[PDB]
Design a protein around this nucleic acid. Structure first.
Length: 14
RNA sequence: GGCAGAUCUGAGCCUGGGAGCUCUCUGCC
């Protein structure tokens, strides 16, 4: 999974 | 009862410069 946190890039596994 | 998503539109350390983690929540038979 790939998402963005507080504008930052956060990725979690798939 | 276990599973599956979500980041400010989920937060916490950023060790994040984001595959780093960490935790909570919802519906199913």
């Amino acid at each position: 999974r790939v998402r963005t946190r507080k504008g930052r890039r956060i990725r979690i596994x798939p």
